[PDB]
Amino acid sequence: MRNRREVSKLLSERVLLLDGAYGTEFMKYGYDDLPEELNIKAPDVVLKVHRSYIESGSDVILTNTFGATRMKLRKHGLEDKLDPIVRNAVRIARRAAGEKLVFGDIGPTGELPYPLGSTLFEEFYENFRETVEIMVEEGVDGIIFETFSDILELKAAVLAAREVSRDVFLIAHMTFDEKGRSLTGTDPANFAITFDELDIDALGINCSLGPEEILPIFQELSQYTDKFLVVEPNAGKPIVENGKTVYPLKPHDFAVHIDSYYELGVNIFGGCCGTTPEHVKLFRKVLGNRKPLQRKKKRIFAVSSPSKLVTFDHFVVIGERINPAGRKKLWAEMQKGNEEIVIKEAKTQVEKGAEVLDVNFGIESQIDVRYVEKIVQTLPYVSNVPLSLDIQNVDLTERALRAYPGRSLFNSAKVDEEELEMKINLLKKYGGTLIVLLMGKDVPKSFEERKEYFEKALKILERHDFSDRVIFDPGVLPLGAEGKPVEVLKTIEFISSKGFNTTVGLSNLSFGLPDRSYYNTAFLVLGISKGLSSAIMNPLDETLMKTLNATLVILEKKE
């Protein structure tokens, strides 16, 4: 019915009120059936609860479809009922809402992504796409992905939704535990940074905690995104009565928190577990008519995995090892789809100090895309750290970016209009940062030339509003082939003085000479003294890593 720009307009003018819990209301009416099943078995009960919330003052109601996706319904022997369940749900909600807003409610599948579970990104994508198709056809005014615990599954959900419709208002929610972390390790800042740049309209938090506990978590989220914000806390902390978990926070004690959320910039407020029509009635009275607070956000350069957010405010070690070039054994195993060998390589580098891992598949024409998808999806979970996707083929790049669990670093785009625009567009759609290598028509052979490439790059990045999502690689050349490393050090100093992060493929400096470890070490120390903020390097080189740490301590960057 209404599109994202219309809903956005309304939100910019007034804070809206959502609804309350449905399952527990169905139970009070004597129906313990799977909530979604009532859309077919007892539609009158669903309608009654929707009407109770509309009459309580809700501006928006959620369809009775939390578990309505093929992957979850299958677990109840209802996969073949997906269509009627979702269509009926939207029709019933629309009948109750009238002119008010109806948002499709889509929850997670309950299936973890490979390698925790057996599901690959593309299966999650198709699963969510199907439910979104039905909701869009039936006329929802928006869609909210509720209670997600994993960023990859949520990323698949929002990307699938946006593919179905570029006009539907999309809201992404994650649920956090008392420690402020999702099931697979994502904290509020990580969630905000990763999703703020995707084409969604709002971010929010719901479930797991009460209004008091979510406040500091919601605050952190609000500081890192300028998109609309939503919150649906449970009715306080859970307590067990008569052997059951109940959320006892009464209307007044819940309602008094509305101001605290308003102060943090909330745009839509509602309740989750334990919330009843009585709660919503008071929320309506207390909320009244208020214009939302101005939205801004703190800006930082960071990349992430489900459990780790790596901010470039300290020297970042990027492990170079997962690269088959010059590695017979590794190359052979990648070709046969060996995952364990890559996993061990990843874990070992992290254990040695790598905070990010570069991942390259050598001659991509000889590697199985499915293997790439599994590796790209697997490493962030098992090694815990973010990845630097070192991929040449634009096609493989897209497959990797889509399935990447978090905000990645994409390895090199040369200073070439076509190449940059192409990679920039992929990163804008799937999220991520970019390493821009200072070369194009041939390799620069002086500081002056690298500076020109830098300035040409800035011009291109500026025209594509991407200047804040790049790290510059000045281009280290082999000492033997007269690489003139001094020219690179000057370039690092120049770029650092301009406020941009830098990196280098350290090992390329000594590819073809003995004692390469010493040349790599000397260059890194010198580079860091000039502002180098990261390096793709060998974390298994004890000399290099020990001297690096010593350098940082000496320069008072750590201890």
CA distance 511 to 506: 10
For CA atoms 162, 166, 167, 169, give the dihedral sign.
positive
Q: Does 411 carry a binding-site annotation?
A: yes
Label residues 516-553 b or e (16+ Cβ within 10 Å = b): bbebbbebbbbbbebbbbbbbbbbbbeebbebbbebee
| 272 annotated ligand binder | yes
516 is in an annotated binding site: yes
DSSP state of 112: P
- Which residues make beta-bridge pairs with 106? 145
Peptide bond into 238 cis (omega under 30): no
Task: Return the axis-axis angle of helices 277-287 and 43-56, rounded to nearest 10°.
Answer: 30
Helix H or strand E segment including 545:
helix 542-554
User: Which of 204, 200, 249 is CA-nearest to residue 222?
Assistant: 204
Both structure tokens of 379: 């490493």
SS3 at position 298: coil
Residue 453 phi, psi dihedral angles, 5° rounding:
-65, -40
For the chain, domains (ranges, CATH) are 1-300 (3.20.20.330), 301-559 (3.20.20.20)
Exposure letters 259-295 (e unless 16+ CB within 10 A, then b):
eebbebbbbbbbbbbbbbbebbbbbbebbeeeebeee
Does an H or E element contain 202, and which?
strand 202-206
Whether the Cβ atoms of residue 433 and residue 410 lie closer than 8 Å to each other:
yes
CB-side neighbour CA atoms (13 Å) of 84: 11
The single residue listed with the structure tokens 């539609």 is 43
What angle separates helix 121-137 from helix 369-382, to the nearest 10 degrees?
100
**Contact (CB, 8 A) for 268 and 228:** yes
The answer to whether the annotation marks 450 as part of a ligand binding site is no
Residue pair 14/289 in contact (Cβ under 8 Å)? The answer is: yes
Contact 230, 268 (CB under 8 A): yes
Distances in Å between the Cα of 57 and the Cα atoms of 17, 94, 100, 284 are 8, 15, 10, 6
Residue 14: helix, strand or coil by DSSP? Answer: coil
Question: What DSSP character marks residue 197?
Answer: T
Number of C-beta neighbours around residue 44 at 10 A = 9
How is residue 113 annotated by DSSP?
Answer: B
Q: Helix, strand, or coil here: 554?
A: helix
Sequence-distant (6+) residues with CB within 8 A of 378 are 114, 115, 339, 343
Residue 145: CB partners within 8 Å, gap ≥ 6? 106, 107, 108, 128, 154, 157, 158, 161, 170, 171, 172, 173
**Residue 105 near residue 144 (C-beta atoms within 8 A):** yes
The CA distance from 401 to 544, in Å, is 31
Compute the distance between CA of residue 17 and CA of residue 280 in angstroms, rounded to an integer: 8
3-class state of residue 51 by DSSP: helix
Distance separating alpha carbons of residues 41 and 43, to the nearest angstrom: 6
Q: Does the CA dihedral 22-23-24-30 come out positive or negative?
A: positive
The C-alpha atoms of residue 363 and residue 554 are separated, in whole angstroms, by 41
The conformational region for residue 211 under phi > 0 = left, psi -120 to 50 = alpha, else beta, is alpha
**φ/ψ of residue 310, rounded to 5:** -105, 110
Beta bridge partners of 202: 171, 228
Whether 234 has a binding-site annotation, put simply, is yes
Q: Which helix (H) or strand (E) holds 228?
A: strand 228-232
Backbone angles phi, psi at 433, to 5 degrees: -115, 165
Q: Is 453 known to sit in a ligand binding site?
A: no
Between the CA of residue 425 and those of 164, 327, 422, 431, 498, what are the distances in Å? 19, 33, 5, 9, 25
Residues 6+ apart with CB under 8 A from 260: 211, 215
> Does the annotation flag 360 for ligand binding?
no
Side chain identity at residue 116, one-letter code? L
Q: Indicate the residue type of 488.
A: V
Q: For residues 391 and 371, what is the distance between their CA atoms, to the nearest angstrom?
A: 14
Find how far residue 390's CA is from the centre of its chain.
19
491 annotated ligand-binding residue: no
Query: Which ranges constitute the DSSP H helices of 404-531?
Result: 417-430, 447-463, 485-497, 516-529
Q: Is 139 annotated as a binding residue?
A: no
Rounded to whole angstroms, how far apart are CA atoms 186 and 175?
10
**Around Cβ 376, how many Cβ atoms within 10 Å?**
24
Query: In the chain, what is the straight-line distance between the N-terminal and C-terminal CA atoms, in Å?
Result: 58
433-437 and 470-473 as β-strands: parallel, antiparallel, unpaired? Answer: parallel
Are 78 and 70 contacting, i.e. CB atoms less than 8 angstroms apart? no
The DSSP symbol for 304 reads: E
Longest dimension (CA), the chain: 82
The CA-CA-CA angle for residues 270, 255, 25, to 5°, reads 55
Q: State how far Cα 526 lies from the chain centre.
A: 35
Sign of the dihedral through C-alpha 319, 322, 324, 326:
positive
Output the six-digit token pair for 131: 């439910």
Give the integer Cα–Cα distance in Å for 388 and 358.
Answer: 4
- Please check if 313 is assigned to a binding site: no
Runs of H (alpha helix) within 256-368: 258-263, 277-287, 328-335, 340-351
